[PDB]
Design a binder for this molecule. Structure first.
Ligand SMILES: *C(=O)[C@H](CO/N=C(\CCC(=O)O)C(=O)O)NC(=O)/C(=N\OCc1cc(=O)c(O)cn1O)c1csc(N)n1
Length: 499
């Protein structure tokens, strides 16, 4: 080794507004030439103490490595701590300017921003996904070692350590803080195991917030269990249940055979498909219109519509909105989930698909799907980075069918017997709850607002609420209301519910 690489300054990660999220902070690494340290043995106890180390263990280490010309003493200390060891004037001890990451928002954006390893290389989240952009390239400086390893002179500074590039995230730190606090509070109040909350800008494909509970302080990574490190919104796959019925309804409305005032008979709240029985959660209905099917979350109702239209039209919509499909985000450990397909769709698979059983999705897929519906049936590619020029997007559902589904979803939140807990102060809000049985449950609420001209889509996933109430509308809906209210206010969205 006659040439050494100067660690590059890792690029700044900021939120959409330039609020710092990952900052490269100067640190100092101490290394030694054992052949030189072996000539200053009386100095070892002073040095042993200065680096923390036990006196005899430190000496054993230098005696074993006595023939080597380089070893690390201690990596990434505070510059002043490094200074304090250099000030001892121990022959063979040399310093290196190094970089370590500091995460100002800490636990609030841990899962999204991720973290770097010992070597300042991206390991998790955005740190890894954008490692090439962030890392830059180290620089080579020529050194002059006589023979014993003693540095005489820096001959030629050929290549300079090119710093990493800045990266602005789509995340709004104000919305992220609001989402994190409200999800944390919901978990406490419901005695929940875990939770996820995703906020999307419907017009840009931007992830405005992505929070998971439990979270970790990335700055104090020691002791940590992977349960708090899981980026659940992108990794945890679940059956979306009744939250996918608006998509089955979109295929119904696009077929030409269905209108919202159409009536379905769901009595007695059960439907036998030979060996299999479709069962409604509440079984006190007979005739329901299409909005009623969504309000009462009738699996029987949607299965009957599904038999009429075919599972092919339902599969298509779900697939086009991104459920069980690649998000193109390239995040570490990102699960794609599953949208089963068939040549010939059997009656049982048709029903289960219509009501969200069998298929598995991520919180991120569900939010993106709701964003397409909120964005007048137009799907915009997902983004974790600030979007300056909006991509063209794909018309996945017709503007008219999307507008009708929106009105129905507004009625799911507003109408008698609906999800009144999702209601947003001064705005019309639209959405659908879900309760997936795992005897444990996953509480879901997906929606968007203002129901008039939608701006933001939101998915709230509450994993295992241990209180008497577990339905998505009891558990996840009040979280949506609070976070949606705060987000509409922060983005200065005009109210649509005035006289
Ligand atoms: C939608 O998510 C449905 C219906 O329940 N949804 C509710 C409950 C509130 C209410 O309407 O009274 C909501 O909107 O919050 N979810 C289910 O049907 C699921 N589980 O419930 C039990 C169940 C499961 C099942 O497979 C079945 O055929 C019948 N029942 O009763 C569910 C759907 S996917 C999954 N893992 N669970």
């Amino acid at each position: 080794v006659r040439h050494i690489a100067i660690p590059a300054h890792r690029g700044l990660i900021t939120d959409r507004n330039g609020e710092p999220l990952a900052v490269s902070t100067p640190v100092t690494t101490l290394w030694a030439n054992p052949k030189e340290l072996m000539t200053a043995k009386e100095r070892w106890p002073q040095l042993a103490a200065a680096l923390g180390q036990d006196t005899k263990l430190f000496a054993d280490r230098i005696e074993q490595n006595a023939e080597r010309e380089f070893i690390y003493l201690v990596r990434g200390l505070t510059p002043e701590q490094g200074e304090g060891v250099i000030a001892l004037k121990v022959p063979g001890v040399y310093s290196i300017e190094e970089f370590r990451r500091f995460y100002p928002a800490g636990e609030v954006v841990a899962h999204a921003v991720g973290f770097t390893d010992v070597d300042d290389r991206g390991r998790e989240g955005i740190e890894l996904a954008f490692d090439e952009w962030l890392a830059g390239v180290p620089g080579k400086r020529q050194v002059l070692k006589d023979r014993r390893g003693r540095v005489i002179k820096d001959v030629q500074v050929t290549k300079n350590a090119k710093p990493g590039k800045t990266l602005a995230l789509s995340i709004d730190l104000r919305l992220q803080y609001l989402a994190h606090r409200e999800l944390r509070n919901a978990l406490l109040e419901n005695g929940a195991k875990a939770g996820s909350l995703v906020i999307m800008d419907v017009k840009t494909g931007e992830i405005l917030a992505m929070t998971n509970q439990p979270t970790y302080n990335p700055n104090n990574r020691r002791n940590l269990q992977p349960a708090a490190m899981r980026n659940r919104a992108m990794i945890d796959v679940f059956e979306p249940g009744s939250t996918v019925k608006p998509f089955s309804m979109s295929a119904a409305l696009a077929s030409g055979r269905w209108k919202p005032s159409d009536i379905v008979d769901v009595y007695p709240g059960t439907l036998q498909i030979g060996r299999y029985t479709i069962r409604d959660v509440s079984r006190n209905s007979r005739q329901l219109d299409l909005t009623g099917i969504l309000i009462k979350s009738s699996n029987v109702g949607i299965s009957k519509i599904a038999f009429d239209i075919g599972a092919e039209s339902i599969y298509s919509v779900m697939q086009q909105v991104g459920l069980g499909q690649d998000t193109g985000l390239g995040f570490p450990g990102e699960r794609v989930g599953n949208l089963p397909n068939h040549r010939k769709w059997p009656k049982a698979e048709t029903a289960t698909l219509a009501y969200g059983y069998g298929l598995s999705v991520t919180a991120i897929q569900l939010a993106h799907a709701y964003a397409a519906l909120a964005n007048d049936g137009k799907s915009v590619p997902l983004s974790m980075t600030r979007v300056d020029r909006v991509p063209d997007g794909v018309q996945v559902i017709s503007p008219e069918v999307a507008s009708t589904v929106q009105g129905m979803l507004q009625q799911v939140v507003e109408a008698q017997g609906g999800v009144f807990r999702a209601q947003v102060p001064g705005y019309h809000a639209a959405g659908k709850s879900g309760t997936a049985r795992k005897n444990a449950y996953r509480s879901l609420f997906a929606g968007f607002a203002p129901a008039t001209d939608p701006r933001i889509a939101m998915v709230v996933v509450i994993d295992e609420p241990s209180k008497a109430g577990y339905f998505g509308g009891l558990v996840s809906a009040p979280v949506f209301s609070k976070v949606m209210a705060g987000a509409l206010r922060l983005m200065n969205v005009p109210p649509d519910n005035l006289p």
